[PDB]
Amino acid sequence: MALRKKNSLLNMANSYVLDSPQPSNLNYFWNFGSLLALCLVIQLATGITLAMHYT
Amino acid sequence: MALRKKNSLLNMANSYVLDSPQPSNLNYFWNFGSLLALCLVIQLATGITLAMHYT
Amino acid sequence: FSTAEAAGVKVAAQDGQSPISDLSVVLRGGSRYATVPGVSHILEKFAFQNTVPKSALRFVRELELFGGKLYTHTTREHIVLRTQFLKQDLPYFVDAFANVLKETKFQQFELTERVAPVAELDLLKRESDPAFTALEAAHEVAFRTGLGNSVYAQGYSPVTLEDVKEFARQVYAKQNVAVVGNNVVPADLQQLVGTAFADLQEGSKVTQAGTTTLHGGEARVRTSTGNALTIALPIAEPKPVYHALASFLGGPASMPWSVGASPLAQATVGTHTSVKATYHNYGDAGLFAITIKGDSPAEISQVAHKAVQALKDTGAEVTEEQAARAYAKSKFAAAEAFENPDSSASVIGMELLSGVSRIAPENVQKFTPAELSEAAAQLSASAKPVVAAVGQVHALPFADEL
Amino acid sequence: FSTAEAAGVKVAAQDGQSPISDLSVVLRGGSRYATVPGVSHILEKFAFQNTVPKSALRFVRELELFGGKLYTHTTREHIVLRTQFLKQDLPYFVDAFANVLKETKFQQFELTERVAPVAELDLLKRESDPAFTALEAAHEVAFRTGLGNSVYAQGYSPVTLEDVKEFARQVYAKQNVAVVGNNVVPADLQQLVGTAFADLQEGSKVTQAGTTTLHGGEARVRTSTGNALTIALPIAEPKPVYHALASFLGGPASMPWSVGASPLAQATVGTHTSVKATYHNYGDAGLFAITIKGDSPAEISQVAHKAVQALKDTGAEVTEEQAARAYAKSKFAAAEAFENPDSSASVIGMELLSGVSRIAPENVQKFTPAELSEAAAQLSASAKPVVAAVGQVHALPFADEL
Amino acid sequence: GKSTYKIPDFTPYLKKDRN
Amino acid sequence: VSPKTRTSNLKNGLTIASESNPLVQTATVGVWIDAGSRNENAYNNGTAHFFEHLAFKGTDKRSQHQLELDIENMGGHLNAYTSRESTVYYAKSFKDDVPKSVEILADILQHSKLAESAIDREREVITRELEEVNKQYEEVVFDHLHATAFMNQPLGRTILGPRENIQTITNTELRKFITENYTADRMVLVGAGAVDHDALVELAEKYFSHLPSSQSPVPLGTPIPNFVGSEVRLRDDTMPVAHIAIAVEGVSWTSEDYYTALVAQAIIGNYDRAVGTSRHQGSRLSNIVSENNLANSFQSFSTSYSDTGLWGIYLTSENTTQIDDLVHFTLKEWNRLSTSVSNLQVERAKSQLKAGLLLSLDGTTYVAEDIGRQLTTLGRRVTPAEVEAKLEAVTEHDVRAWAQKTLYDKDIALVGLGPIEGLYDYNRIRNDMSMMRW
Amino acid sequence: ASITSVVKTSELILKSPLLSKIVVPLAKTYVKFSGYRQLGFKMNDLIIEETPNMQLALRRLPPTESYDRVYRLIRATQFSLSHKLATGNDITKPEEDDHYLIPYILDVEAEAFEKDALDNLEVV
Ligand code: HEM
Ligand code: HEM
Ligand SMILES: CCCCCCCCCCCCO[C@@H]1O[C@H](CO)[C@@H](O[C@H]2O[C@H](CO)[C@@H](O)[C@H](O)[C@H]2O)[C@H](O)[C@H]1O
Ligand SMILES: CCCCCCCCCCCCO[C@@H]1O[C@H](CO)[C@@H](O[C@H]2O[C@H](CO)[C@@H](O)[C@H](O)[C@H]2O)[C@H](O)[C@H]1O
């Protein structure tokens, strides 16, 4: 058995972002989920940075 | 099948805090894990409160 | 049981003084009449499934409100569907039987999900007893087809919905149905069956494909679940004397923690083995069997020798005492059979369908020692002995050894 | 093959002109000698397991460095362990055989995890062919014990480590071992076996518990995986004429996409069935079998009638042409058997372990039409015919039908 | 030590009025 | 309407009770005794069962062999069983073979040899029975259930007794037991089927007249049990099916709540995957179990004794990863007897029982067993009219009241046998005996 | 909604001459504009199946019908991802749009609804 499936921690990432079985016909409107993830990451990075300068 | 096992979200709580199978002979030194969880919660609650007053 | 006729259906009822009635529909649809192996078992299991007027679900929930119970079984000769209920609920049960015979929707999902799985559990439960297997195997060897067909559905020969539907078209017909009512007012049953079963097809009498031929042989069924051995003798001319002989030879004990005084019972002494002589009349042929079960194949073998010897010794001489003992044990066996509702139904069922007037327990013939010894002589010297071994078959006897 | 003796072990070797040598140890340890059912199969599968000098793992990895191959099989008469390697690596293989016979640690885990599972897969693969099952069943009916014991280990009767250890104590002894060397210098083998097998127990000749008794009968193995039917005739006096008769009756085609000119081959016309006559000499008894496989039980039944007729017709008259055809087909069969390493080993093994001189293909007797017809007459008029049916057994013939 | 129907001794802990 | 059960007494105080059926040709006569294992102490535990084996081993007149022959010549058979509170010895025969059978029963009860040689012989037979009950899983489960529920009390003892006692039972102890216990005032001679009452009474006067009377004649079915909530786990990973019983302290024969407990039992009811109709039963537990394949079977029971009872359920299951669900759903179905039952369930269960209590009585043996059981537990045969009235008196409010006093938040006795790894510990099971939402 | 509901209501409409006269032509145009036939689906292929009832109905399909349904779903998914429509024989003709699943789901639901009713019976 491959490490990504054997190891409990890796397996959780694997099940969500790598081996996750998806329909083969998702159109471009299924891409907003990952954009919202990207927005959330940008807001955390910029937000924490502004907090280092804001009073 | 019982809801705590059927529902995916409930099942995660269930697997960690309720049906989790533990050895029957843990002594009191196995209790520091939950104290550290309690400290972490007190620090979050008090910490967020102080952040509302701190400059 | 007053035999009468109601809209071309033979109805036999005996009124009694009890609050519980047994209504039984006896069908000429046992396994000897089967077209495909196992169909009569499946047809029995398909009774009280979905009909057009009333779903299986609705029937069961309403039967629970009357506190009725439902019992079904298949033999080589009949399918028997029996209901037990309170006297007053008779019209409900008559109409339910009518719906089953007229309006069963034989749906493929019922066969796959409901009927076949239940039939499979039925058989597995019976086969837990190795003696059952041995006596089944013996009939298969003795008769091959007809009486030799299996009674129960097996996985190796799958029954299809078309098979069951065809068979049911033949069986569920006025010509193959008898209604038997225990503790049912005979006048009232005739009136109800006369209204409910009026629109049932007439059909024709179901017949056995091919005549009954007798054969000898061996069957050796390798199981890991206990050991048994049947020594059967097919009978070409079934005679009532074989009942007396079966009861004489006996085998089971007639009191707890004892061996018994029967010749076959005395053959088991010092062994944890049981023995049982049985005679089965099937009208045109018969089967006299001696079945031996036990945990030790060595003990079974030992008993089997003694068992055959016992039968030969009987062929020599029986005493007057022994012949009277046989009459007594046989009258009793006849009485208790006519009492148990399961067997009762089929007894009058055979009288109604076939036409073999029933032998009342009070009319069971007394056989002289001469007649009994002559019958046992005719069995020890049969040209067609069957032996069915089940279990550690490498360690059990063979026909030519016995 | 120059037969000699090296330290109490019989050694037969034939030098050749090839880079490939076959060394075979033939053991008098086949199933007819089996203490318990299946033990000879398990002992065969326990060869080249862990010995005290060398683990199974180390053996396999070193055999791969020599590019040797290992082949083992069990018959009713022998266990054969064969290695195929380059000529030069002979001493290694001699010593490996010696370790197996002297120093096998029969460990319970090897039995549970390694040997038994492999033996089970071996058997399941063989049983995929219903003809194999039919011919196995036929031997069981014909002989009961001895030759009638199963060759392969079955799940229903488990072999224990104590059973295998006991059997091996009898079998792995100078008295039950023959070494056969194809393309091995005979002088060199004698010298090596003489040093390596010097410390092997002497032991005693393994014998069949009980004398070979012949019986007739039927076996009816109900499977769902194809249909076959064997018609066997046990032979009390094995004679070489039955080889000629088996080849005459034939069954397989001598040409692609053809039926064949053999009487049994001509019995299959218009059916997708195959047929095969075989004769097995086992020294003290023999078995002449005709096996028929096919997908249709109706076709099998049809062919089976023609097949028995063919045998009867042969009993009547054989032509001179047909007798010569039999001689030719039989000489050929003998030659190719002595070529194939598996069968070769066992042929000289029999000569060495018993004393029955091999019949060289060049010495195969020519039988007149008189002698062949006489032999077929004896078979058609056998008092003990065996019939083993496999598959839809309710649809296949019975002995008394044939 | 052998019979499983002989319940081990719990009398040190059983309350009389337990029901 | 069934024929009337006639009842007479003798002078010694033997009750004769008969229910004739002129439609059958066979009769069951027998003696029901208000005595069983519960009447032993700890030292002579096993005696009652021992006697059952020796009753058939010969009398002062007939030897073991003569006895066998006499019964064979009758035509019918004899049978016996010993329970905790009851012993039965009966003879099924032909109509006109009743005088023989009464004579044989009277002989084996009053005039048994109990010869040292036979005691010694049976001592091995009984010893082997200790190692073969092991196979009858339902019985194993129920025997442990009584042992734990009635820990260190007379009802908690087995019928067979310990191995130790079997080796030390003497003819003296046997004689003493049957002299103290098998007394006329504790015995009922019962005839069902083709029997005349007046003929049976004459046979009783002829054969059972020299029976001992007890010093203190109490009425029939006269009795202190202290239930212990507890568990026995007999894990056996090699078994394919798990067998579990759960029980609470139930009701005695003469409880006011006897019928209420039967109705409550009927609301849960029985289930068997092998029976065709079972997937369509109305019972809520039946539906849950069948839809989810949680069990092969379950069987609700309500066992009564003179002064206590056990009410509970027996489950069997191959679904070893969902035993927790099976037990969870079962106990939540019991909770609803306290919280939710309405006239809907109650009237359905009453309907099913009104017939069920009559349907049980099929053949003569069942009728005789019914007359015998009732006479030795209640002191009278309860007519179907009275039974129908007592059932009709059970309301939804009565069931809720009973369940709230008997089941809700009460201690259970729990026995698990087989692959029960997935059965949780006692606390988690017992926590399902209540609902936090209520 | 339940398939039973849909089927019963439709039958009420088809009975009424007036109603059918106005509804049946509309329903035919609706189906034409819906355009599921242009992906080679039959109407019943579109019914939501992630329900216990529907799972049971699908298990009761004859093997051939089941195998064909799997092919239609796979084919349609491939047209979807390619942004193509069915052409030629892949287009579902009105005569091929058979209600293969409706009978099975109606039986499953019939029993489920009877079960709910009977769970609420009151002995009178
Ligand atoms: C979902 C995540 C977030 C959203 C939608 C969000 C949104 C906003 C918005 C709308 C403003 C007003 C911006 C302006 O007009 O200047 C703002 C300001 C701010 N946010 Fe966030 N924010 C997010 C996360 C965070 C996080 C994680 C931090 C960490 C501290 C943060 C720190 C700040 C700070 C310090 C400011 C004030 C300085 C400023 O206005 O630029 N934000 N945020
Ligand atoms: C693991 C969790 C935490 C630990 C161990 C921790 C530890 C500390 C310590 C040691 C100090 C200095 C305390 C003093 O002497 O006054 C402090 C101050 C502070 N912490 Fe945390 N902290 C934690 C979490 C948080 C969090 C989540 C916040 C959220 C904002 C927070 C906000 C503060 C603030 C505002 C102060 C300064 C005010 C003060 O000194 O009281 N802390 N913390
Ligand atoms: C999205 C950011 C990436 C980080 C991962 C997201 C964190 C969430 C993971 C925590 C929840 C647990 O996630 C749960 O884990 C197991 C294994 O990991 C998955 O299990 C699934 O995958 C494994 C193998 O890959 C199979 O054995 C299993 O049959 C299948 O259901 C569950 O479908 C998922 O619900
Ligand atoms: C302690 C903080 C409380 C919050 C709980 C922690 C939240 C994140 C936990 C989820 C991470 C995935 O956690 C994973 O989930 C599944 C189901 O929940 C568990 O699965 C386990 O339980 C389920 C049933 O209860 C079984 O089907 C399974 O055989 C067993 O392994 C895994 O053992 C666990 O590793």
Numbering used by the authors:
A (entry chain C), B (entry chain N): 1 to 55
C (entry chain M), D (entry chain B): 15 to 416
E (entry chain P): 39 to 57
F (entry chain L): 26 to 248, 260 to 474
G (entry chain G): 2 to 125
From the paper:
The cytochrome bc 1 complex, also known as respiratory complex III (CIII), in the electron-transfer chain of the inner mitochondrial membrane is a homodimer (CIII2) of two biochemically identical protomers. CIII2 catalyses the transfer of electrons from the lipophilic two-electron donor ubiquinol (QH2) to the water-soluble, one-electron acceptor protein cytochrome c, contributing to an electrochemical proton gradient across the membrane. The Rieske domain is tethered to the complex by one transmembrane helix and a connecting flexible linker that acts as a hinge.
A total of nine CIII2 samples were prepared for cryo-EM.(i) Apo: without additives (partially reduced). In intermediate positions, the tip of the Rieske domain is close to the ef-loop of cyt b. In the apo sample without antimycin A, density for Trp142 appeared to be very weak with partial occupancy in both positions. The densities of the cd 1-helix and the ef-loop were weaker and more difficult to model when the Rieske domain was in the intermediate position in CIII2 samples without added oxidant or reductant, indicating increased flexibility and heterogeneity.
